[PDB]
Design a protein around this ligand. Structure first.
Ligand SMILES: CC(C)(C)c1ccc([C@@H]2NC(=O)c3cccnc3N2)cc1
Ligand SMILES: [Zn+2]
Length: 208
């Protein structure tokens, strides 16, 4: 039941999603090992993901969380990178999209930094890079990220350098405690707490 609607580059909605993508690029401590070496992207396409059933699943859960947290869903727009983006947009987030080995336990991980999500497009640690050239820094191959609506509710704050959320909480917030330039990362433990709103197709750009 999923349809994808192309946004025009002239549309303010395209432009605001592109700006969030581009402006949340940062340098990574691996020197580009996982995600490649780049300062910006070539955005090729932004599509709106429309699925009524998946949307209703999201809003149902959002209301449950809101009602447990003084009518505050604590909703964010966050990036998600995965080899399984095409499964996610069709069937929704579920336990198969969780990172069993992540720093904050087995949940589904989201990032404020688009470049953090870019590290996971080809798998954990960038896997073996693009399927065509086996290059984690491929400048040719088309990559895809999701820009998602995420319900955090009451989030457990972890300071730092599928399971259940901590008792009394709906998510975990991974606050950076060393790298002063990194933005937060977030983990949810219920697939119904995220909706994949935008599918972004892009390339990383080789620095000049
Ligand atoms: C390949 C699997 C399912 C194991 C996977 C997929 C995505 C991610 C995940 N993607 C993110 O965008 C992300 C954002 C912030 C921190 N960690 C992330 N990993 C982890 C693991
Ligand atoms: Zn490639």
């Amino acid at each position: 039941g999923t349809i994808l609607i192309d946004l025009s580059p002239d549309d303010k909605e395209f432009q605001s999603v592109e700006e969030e993508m581009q402006s949340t690029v940062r340098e990574h401590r691996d020197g580009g090992h996982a995600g490649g070496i780049f300062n910006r992207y070539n955005i090729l396409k932004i599509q709106k993901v429309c699925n009524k059933k998946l949307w209703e699943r999201y809003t149902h859960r959002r209301k449950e969380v809101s009602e447990e947290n003084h009518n505050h869903a604590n909703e964010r727009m966050l990036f998600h990178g995965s080899p399984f983006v095409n499964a996610i947009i069709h069937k929704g987030f579920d336990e198969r999209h969780a990172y069993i080995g992540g720093m904050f336990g087995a949940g589904i991980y989201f990032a404020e930094n688009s470049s953090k999500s870019n590290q996971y497009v080809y798998g954990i640690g960038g896997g073996t890079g693009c399927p065509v050239h086996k290059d984690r820094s491929c400048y040719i191959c088309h990559r895809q990220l999701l820009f998602c609506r995420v319900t955090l509710g009451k989030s457990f704050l972890q300071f730092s350098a599928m399971a259940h959320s901590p008792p009394g909480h709906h998510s975990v917030t991974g606050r950076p405690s060393v790298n002063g330039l990194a933005l937060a990362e977030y983990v949810i433990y219920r697939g119904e707490q995220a909706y994949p709103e935008y599918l972004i197709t892009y390339q990383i750009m080789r620095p000049e």
